[PDB]
């Protein structure tokens, strides 16, 4: 955002929307891949507490750790705290989830992760 003459130089997704509080416009401009754009947005949002420092935002981009209540987690662990198998979020077996893939598509709902 700062260093006004940045909009004439080429840019770095990391030298605009990472090491600096950025516009989703410059984010949109730099991303275009609107799926990953939503991903980066989701990042930003969850990383709202990971805005600083820089390496914290880098880790929040890695996504292996759940931020706060766990909106950002994108790992491969699909097991409950006590070893019970996780039911498919979209499937109705054995429970029909009021809160499921249709209601939360932006969390990247995997098989049972």
Partner 1 sequence: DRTRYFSMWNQAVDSYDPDVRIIENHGTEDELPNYCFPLGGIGITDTF
By beta-carbon distance, which residue lies closest to Ca ion? Answer: 11
CB-nearer residue toward partner 1: 8 or 99 = 8
Q: Which residue has the tokens 């209601």?
A: 103
Strands (DSSP E) along the chain, which ranges?
none
Site string for partner 1, 3-32 (x = CB under 8 A): -----xxx----------------------
CB-nearer residue toward partner 1: 3 or 64 = 3
Least separation in angstroms between residue 49's CB and partner 1 is: 29
Alpha helices in 32-103 (DSSP H): 34-46, 54-62
**Number of Cβ within a 10 Å radius of residue 92:** 10
Measured between alpha carbons, how far is 112 from 88 in angstroms, rounded to an integer?
5
Q: Of 78, 76, 12, 66, which is closest to residue 42 (Cα–Cα)?
A: 66
Binding residues (CB under 5 A) for Ca ion: these are: 1-3, 6-7, 11, 26, 29
Site for partner 1 contains 81 (CB under 8 A): no
- Binding partner of residue 29 among partner 1, Ca ion, none, CB under 5 to 8 Å per kind? Ca ion
User: Token digits for 74?
Assistant: 């994108």
Binding site for partner 1 (CB under 8 A): 8-10
């Amino acid at each position: 955002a700062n260093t006004f003459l940045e909009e004439v130089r080429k840019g770095n997704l990391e030298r605009e929307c990472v090491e600096e509080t950025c516009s989703y416009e410059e984010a949109f401009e730099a991303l275009e891949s609107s799926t990953a754009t939503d991903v980066f947005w989701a990042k930003y949002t969850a990383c709202e507490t990971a805005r600083t420092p820089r390496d914290k935002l880098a880790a929040c981009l890695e996504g292996n750790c759940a931020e706060g209540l766990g909106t950002n987690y994108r790992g491969h662990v699909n097991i409950t705290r006590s070893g019970i198998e996780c039911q498919l979020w979209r499937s109705r077996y054995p429970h029909k989830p009021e809160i499921n893939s249709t209601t939360h598509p932006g969390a990247d709902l995997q098989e049972n992760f």
